[PDB]
Design an enzyme around this catalytic site. Structure first.
Site, PDB file in Angstrom:
ATOM      1  CG  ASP A 184     -26.397  -6.970   1.400  1.00 35.76           C
ATOM      2  OD1 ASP A 184     -26.821  -5.822   1.682  1.00 35.76           O
ATOM      3  OD2 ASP A 184     -26.517  -7.463   0.249  1.00 35.76           O
ATOM      4  CE1 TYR A 201     -29.667  -8.458   2.756  1.00 39.52           C
ATOM      5  CE2 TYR A 201     -29.374 -10.536   3.950  1.00 39.52           C
ATOM      6  CZ  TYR A 201     -29.202  -9.779   2.803  1.00 39.52           C
ATOM      7  OH  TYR A 201     -28.597 -10.368   1.706  1.00 39.52           O
ATOM      8  CB  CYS A 219      -0.895   0.057   1.240  1.00 41.34           C
ATOM      9  SG  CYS A 219      -2.210   1.310   1.079  1.00 41.34           S
ATOM     10  CE  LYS A 263     -11.681  24.340   7.676  1.00 43.19           C
ATOM     11  NZ  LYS A 263     -12.484  25.506   7.197  1.00 43.19           N
ATOM     12  CB  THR A 264      -6.822  27.813  10.174  1.00 40.47           C
ATOM     13  OG1 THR A 264      -8.245  27.803  10.314  1.00 40.47           O
ATOM     14  CG2 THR A 264      -6.411  29.153   9.601  1.00 40.47           C
ATOM     15  CB  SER A 265      -2.696  24.876  11.799  1.00 42.33           C
ATOM     16  OG  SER A 265      -3.569  23.766  11.906  1.00 42.33           O
TER      17      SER A 265
HETATM   18  N1  LIG Z   1      -2.112  18.708  14.469  1.00 37.40           N
HETATM   19  C1  LIG Z   1      -1.956  19.547  15.526  1.00 37.40           C
HETATM   20  N2  LIG Z   1      -1.315  19.142  16.705  1.00 37.40           N
HETATM   21  C2  LIG Z   1      -1.221  20.077  17.700  1.00 37.40           C
HETATM   22  N3  LIG Z   1      -1.694  21.344  17.616  1.00 37.40           N
HETATM   23  C3  LIG Z   1      -2.323  21.799  16.487  1.00 37.40           C
HETATM   24  C4  LIG Z   1      -2.457  20.889  15.432  1.00 37.40           C
HETATM   25  N4  LIG Z   1      -3.088  21.465  14.407  1.00 37.40           N
HETATM   26  C5  LIG Z   1      -3.372  22.703  14.808  1.00 37.40           C
HETATM   27  N5  LIG Z   1      -2.904  22.933  16.059  1.00 37.40           N
HETATM   28  C6  LIG Z   1      -3.092  24.201  16.858  1.00 37.40           C
HETATM   29  O1  LIG Z   1      -4.390  24.666  17.054  1.00 37.40           O
HETATM   30  C7  LIG Z   1      -4.647  26.046  17.070  1.00 37.40           C
HETATM   31  C8  LIG Z   1      -5.712  26.286  15.989  1.00 37.40           C
HETATM   32  O2  LIG Z   1      -5.106  26.078  14.733  1.00 37.40           O
HETATM   33  P1  LIG Z   1      -5.972  26.754  13.573  1.00 37.40           P
HETATM   34  O3  LIG Z   1      -5.192  26.784  12.299  1.00 37.40           O
HETATM   35  O4  LIG Z   1      -6.512  28.111  13.994  1.00 37.40           O
HETATM   36  O5  LIG Z   1      -7.148  25.697  13.459  1.00 37.40           O
HETATM   37  P2  LIG Z   1      -8.783  25.561  13.424  1.00 37.40           P
HETATM   38  O6  LIG Z   1      -9.009  24.322  14.222  1.00 37.40           O
HETATM   39  O7  LIG Z   1      -9.054  25.326  12.013  1.00 37.40           O
HETATM   40  N6  LIG Z   1      -9.619  26.658  14.191  1.00 37.40           N
HETATM   41  P3  LIG Z   1     -11.106  26.568  14.992  1.00 37.40           P
HETATM   42  O8  LIG Z   1     -11.836  25.419  14.321  1.00 37.40           O
HETATM   43  O9  LIG Z   1     -11.743  27.913  14.733  1.00 37.40           O
HETATM   44  O10 LIG Z   1     -10.724  26.313  16.437  1.00 37.40           O
HETATM   45  C9  LIG Z   1      -3.266  26.611  16.808  1.00 37.40           C
HETATM   46  O11 LIG Z   1      -2.776  26.965  18.074  1.00 37.40           O
HETATM   47  C10 LIG Z   1      -2.437  25.415  16.384  1.00 37.40           C
HETATM   48  O12 LIG Z   1      -2.192  25.283  15.012  1.00 37.40           O
HETATM   49 MG   LIG Z   2     -11.320  29.774  10.655  1.00 30.48          MG
END
Ligand SMILES: Nc1ncnc2c1ncn2[C@@H]1O[C@H](COP(=O)(O)OP(=O)(O)NP(=O)(O)O)[C@@H](O)[C@@H]1O
Ligand SMILES: [Mg+2]
Length: 1020
Positions: free
Chosen positions: A597, A775, A24, A73-75
């Site tokens: 199933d 089923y 894989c 996500k943002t990070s």
């Molecule tokens: N994989 C990870 N492990 C540890 N810390 C993380 C990780 N990913 C993100 N963080 C942290 O989390 C905080 C939020 O990250 P950010 O990019 O703002 O994410 P977010 O979850 O999309 N926001 P929200 O959903 O509004 O809380 C930042 O302090 C850090 O990036």
């Molecule tokens: Mg956001």
């Protein structure tokens, strides 16, 4: 070309028994691990779902990022952006507010401050602030920036002149879908130039795009991302919840609403009307800190958010008006509903209003001939109904339990709102799903109940009664939310490809948690949605990924003191692609859950999958005998591993059909050369009985018919003198019939409705797939506890026990919820139970299942049997008949024949007399029963066996009865006269058991195959 762990053994061909690189491994796998480590240096340990996204991006795949909050996500985006820049790939990150753009820029530098460069020739940002100098510095250099961050505004204004990007990240997707052009302008940045001429586009993805799920309207504009980037966005609502629901038949502003306010603070109250809302503010203000909202003025919202206020009063309408429709995961802790959110429709209202709103009301009744509008040109017209309505309803009292009638007026419970209202009370985070609480108080008893009942339809909707542990509750809430704050430290929610057979099932299931985001991969569609247990990516295998090959080994089996099944891709698409497709998703999840199933074939699929997706990730099996949110979750809490025993029975069974089927069918082509012929043993047998019934039907044309009495006597005289001598006449009361099982269902489906067994199975399947019945392939009559609890909720007082059968692990076929055929049809129109392609026939069927079942649990019934002794022309026959039967069970399932009664009397008779067959030819229904009595065929096969005969032109039907054809006969007589020992009823009946045997883990498949291999080469 596959080694380690073309031709995989225990993917050209899977050569399997049962019981140096890697398997894989994908290209970007070495590009990924680097990224992870990288991530580990700027943020931390990549979360399962964060790792899955990467893959997606490292393979240049655009999709709609859907997942629990708290997940990085943002990070990720930022981080991944920075990583691609270090690879000199260039990325664009779009935000919806100035500050975010700024926070974003910082977040990059910070990362870079970890073995990263940081140079000016790297990052560039822009927003509404910045002066004369830095604004110039941006534009004049923009395009040499490997990373460009800006608000969603700058895009509309300056799409052209912005270069192109390999990776573009959109934080908020509604910040884009707002203006149609935004879309265009985005694709443009990716290399998709519109072509006025063709008025359509054409272009090659230059990069890849990643966006959030949407909260606001959809719009046919988004549809663009489908045809261009193979992906639909889909909502971020996610309909799951914890929430403790309490129901109180008192709405006293005093001893109640205020006692609930004992539950700490941060509660959000919901009043029927704005008028009714304010009427409380004063009633409650010198106890607890308050707040009120709406069009008038807000402010109390900020006061709430900041802590001044402890609670809020408002309407389901106005609260939305607020930011994000009021969404305070950490503040909001509970909500009280003063008055059940309801909908009204007056008697004198009928007149004006949506026609599709007249249908609903059209139901609720049906007593008389109003079904005559049910079937409809739809618009047979509402008018005729509205009128029919006015006339009748005051006196007439409907039977429903989810609404109230009272006396002229129908009150509709509104759950939609309720769910949505109490949903702000529970959110999904990287740490699970905050605990909620919703206190619904209503004085209108009858109504409250209706809600309570209606709630049940939305499953997870049971209510308590202040029999709550308040002390705990307050803690769980404050505790729970405490978790959320610390969301940054969890990762309990991980991906998990959830494989089900058909697309229907896929859709039904993914929708159970919301509007999932889609993605169409090379050879498969994937509905991905988040939930308390994982980040499901339900996908449909579209049946068996592989089947027995036809070349390798002896008809698919490698022999010579061996027996090794050989599997191959199927079938203008090749199933090899779904596998290749599946291995990729699997790759990205590192965890697979097959939910096919609950039978052997189903187990056979997980099996292959277990194998084929080797290396990728764990492959557990989810078992559930009904397709419903509740069952699925239960399953997600009781996973198991592929049950090898089922597989073996799955295999062997196959191998026979291959061997005994091919070789025999062949012998049928050798003689009187006519391929397209087919032999099946089981079907030769049956086909046999089918004849040994026809040959007996052309006789004893006796019989005479009286004119008044439902009499039928084997005589041959026109007029005569009969004698009715009343003998016995007992009153018996006994148990109804067992709940349907594949066998008896196909039968009643043939006797009552006039459906062919192939049809019924098809229907059943679709009924099963639409979470309305357990089923359909089953030989058990067993009734799960839950199933009894379903009947009890319908019957009531008339409900008896009856577990019915207590063997195997299989259960009978029966309704998934206490809901007559109407109720279903209704709810469907009402939009409560969503489903796919169902026509009358389905409910025609769903109907019998419901009856049969509810009958099975219903009270014993009374049946009157009057015997009779008749003597005529020296002959005297004595027959007994049912003159009357009463009770619930019979009102539901008319099992017995209530022939006509006949007062005693030796008077002058007048018969018609006729030349009737000795016996009449079998009917799919009878023949199906023999199959059972006699021991031939199984649930997965009863129908198929019978069909074949019709399609190989061995049989036809006349007057609804089965009849052979020469073609068939000469066929039967062939196999019988010369290979009778392979078609022997006994051989088929014994063999038919060795399978069940092997399936239960009693007989050995190997030692089972020898007897089969031997037996077969015994003709070769
Ligand atoms: N994989 C990870 N492990 C540890 N810390 C993380 C990780 N990913 C993100 N963080 C942290 O989390 C905080 C939020 O990250 P950010 O990019 O703002 O994410 P977010 O979850 O999309 N926001 P929200 O959903 O509004 O809380 C930042 O302090 C850090 O990036
Ligand atoms: Mg956001």
């Amino acid at each position: 070309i596959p080694v380690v762990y073309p031709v995989c053994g225990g993917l050209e061909s899977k050569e399997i028994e049962k019981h140096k690189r890697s398997l894989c491994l994908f290209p970007e796998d070495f590009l990924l691990k680097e990224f992870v480590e990288f991530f580990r240096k700027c943020v931390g340990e990549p979360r399962a779902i964060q790792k899955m996204w990467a893959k997606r991006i490292l393979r240049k795949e655009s999709f709609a990022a859907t997942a629990p909050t708290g997940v990085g996500k943002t990070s990720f985006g930022l981080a991944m952006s920075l990583f691609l820049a270090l690879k000199g790939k260039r990325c664009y990150v779009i935000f919806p507010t100035s500050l975010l753009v700024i926070q974003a820029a910082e977040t990059i530098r910070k990362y870079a401050e970890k073995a990263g460069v940081g140079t000016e020739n790297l990052i560039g940002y822009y927003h509404g602030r910045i002066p004369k100098r830095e604004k110039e510095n941006f534009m004049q250099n923009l395009r040499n920036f490997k990373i460009v961050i800006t608000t969603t505004q700058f895009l509309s204004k300056h799409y052209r002149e912005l270069g192109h990007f390999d990776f573009i990240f959109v934080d908020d997707v509604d910040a884009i879908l707002k203006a149609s052009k935004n879309v265009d302008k985005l694709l443009h940045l990716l290399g998709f130039h519109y072509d006025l001429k063709t008025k359509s586009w054409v272009g090659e993805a230059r990069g890849c795009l990643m966006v959030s799920t949407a909260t606001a309207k959809k719009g046919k504009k988004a549809e663009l991302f489908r045809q261009l980037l193979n992906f639909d966005i889909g909502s971020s609502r996610i309909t799951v919840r914890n929430v403790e629901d309490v129901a109180v038949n008192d709405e006293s502003i005093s001893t109640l609403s205020s006692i609930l306010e004992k539950l700490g603070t941060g509660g959000i109250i919901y009043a029927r009307t704005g008028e009714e809302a304010e009427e409380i503010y004063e009633s409650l203000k010198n106890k607890f800190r308050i707040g009120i909202v709406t069009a008038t003025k807000k402010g109390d919202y900020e006061k709430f958010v900041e802590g001044e206020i402890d609670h809020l009063i408002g309407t389901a309408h106005y609260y939305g008006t607020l930011v994000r429709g009021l969404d305070l995961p950490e503040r909001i802790r509970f909500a009280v509903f003063v008055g059940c959110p309801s909908f009204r429709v007056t008697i004198e209202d009928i007149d004006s209003l949506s026609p599709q709103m007249v249908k609903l009301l059209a139901y609720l009744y049906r007593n008389v001939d109003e079904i005559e509008r049910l079937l409809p040109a739809v618009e047979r017209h509402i008018d005729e109904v509205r009128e029919i309505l006015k006339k009748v309803m005051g006196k007439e009292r409907p039977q429903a339990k989810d609404v109230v009638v009272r006396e002229g007026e129908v009150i509709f419970p509104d759950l939609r709102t309720y769910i949505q209202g109490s949903g702000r009370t529970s959110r999904l985070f990287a740490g699970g799903l905050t605990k909620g609480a919703s206190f619904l108080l209503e004085d209108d008893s009858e109504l409250l109940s209706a809600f309570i009942e209606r709630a049940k339809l939305y499953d997870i909707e049971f209510k308590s009664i202040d029999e709550v542990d308040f002390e705990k509750l307050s803690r769980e809430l404050d505790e729970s939310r405490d978790r959320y704050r610390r969301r940054q430290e969890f990762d309990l929610i991980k991906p998990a490809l959830f494989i089900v057979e058909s697309p229907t099932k896929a859709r039904q299931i993914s929708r159970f948690f919301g509007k999932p985001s889609v993605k169409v991969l090379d050879g498969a569609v994937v509905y991905e949605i988040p939930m308390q247990k994982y980040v499901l990516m339900v996908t449909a295998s579209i049946g068996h990924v592989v089947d027995l090959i036809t070349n390798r080994g002896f008809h698919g089996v490698l022999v010579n003191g061996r027996f090794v099944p050989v599997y191959a891709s199927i079938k203008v698409d090749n199933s090899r692609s779904r596998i290749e497709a599946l291995r990729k998703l699997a790759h990205d999840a590192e965890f697979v859950i097959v939910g096919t199933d609950p039978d052997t074939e189903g187990e056979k699929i997980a099996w292959d999958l277990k194998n084929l997706l080797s290396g990728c990730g764990a492959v557990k099996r989810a078992e559930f005998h009904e397709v419903t949110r509740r069952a699925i979750l239960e399953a997600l809490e009781s996973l198991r591993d592929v049950d090898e025993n089922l597989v073996k029975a799955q295999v062997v069974r196959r191998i026979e059909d291959r061997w005994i089927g091919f070789v025999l069918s062949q012998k049928l082509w050798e003689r009187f050369n006519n391929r397209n012929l087919s032999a099946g043993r089981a079907q030769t047998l049956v086909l046999g009985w089918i004849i040994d019934r026809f040959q007996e039907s052309r006789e004893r044309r006796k019989i005479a018919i009286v004119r008044d009495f439902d009499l039928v006597l084997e005589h041959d005289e026109e007029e005569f003198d009969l004698t009715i001598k009343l003998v016995e006449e007992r009153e018996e009361l006994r148990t109804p019939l067992p709940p349907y099982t594949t066998e008896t269902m196909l039968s009643d489906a043939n006797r009552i409705l006039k459906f062919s067994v192939k049809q019924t199975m098809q229907i059943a399947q679709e009924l099963f797939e639409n979470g309305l019945i357990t089923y359909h392939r089953t030989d058990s009559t067993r009734v799960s506890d839950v199933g009894q609890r379903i009947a009890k909720e319908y019957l009531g007082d008339d409900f008896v026990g009856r577990e019915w059968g207590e063997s195997g692990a299989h259960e009978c076929i029966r309704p998934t919820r206490p809901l007559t055929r109407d109720d279903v049809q209704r709810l469907i129109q009402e939009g409560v139970l969503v489903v796919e392609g169902l026509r009358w026939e389905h409910f025609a069927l769903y109907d019998l299942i419901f009856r049969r079942f509810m009958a099975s649990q219903c009270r014993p019934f009374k049946v009157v049997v009057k015997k009779y002794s008749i003597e005529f022309d020296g002959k005297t026959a004595e027959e007994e008949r049912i003159v009357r039967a009463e009770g619930r069970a019979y009102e539901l399932y008319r099992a017995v024949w209530v022939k006509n009664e006949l007062p005693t009397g030796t008077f002058r008779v007048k018969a018609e007399v006729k030349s009737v067959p000795k016996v009449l030819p079998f009917t799919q229904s009878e023949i199906i029963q023999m199959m059972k009595e006699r021991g031939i065929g199984r649930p997965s096969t009863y129908a198929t066996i019978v069909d074949r005969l019709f399609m190989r032109n061995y049989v036809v039907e006349k007057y609804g009865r089965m009849i052979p054809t020469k073609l068939g006969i000469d066929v039967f007589r062939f196999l019988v006269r010369r290979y009778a020992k392979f078609v022997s009823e006994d051989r088929t009946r014994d063999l038919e058991s060795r399978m069940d045997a092997i399936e239960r883990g009693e007989l050995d498949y190997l030692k089972a195959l020898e007897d089969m291999y031997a037996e077969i080469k015994s003709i070769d």
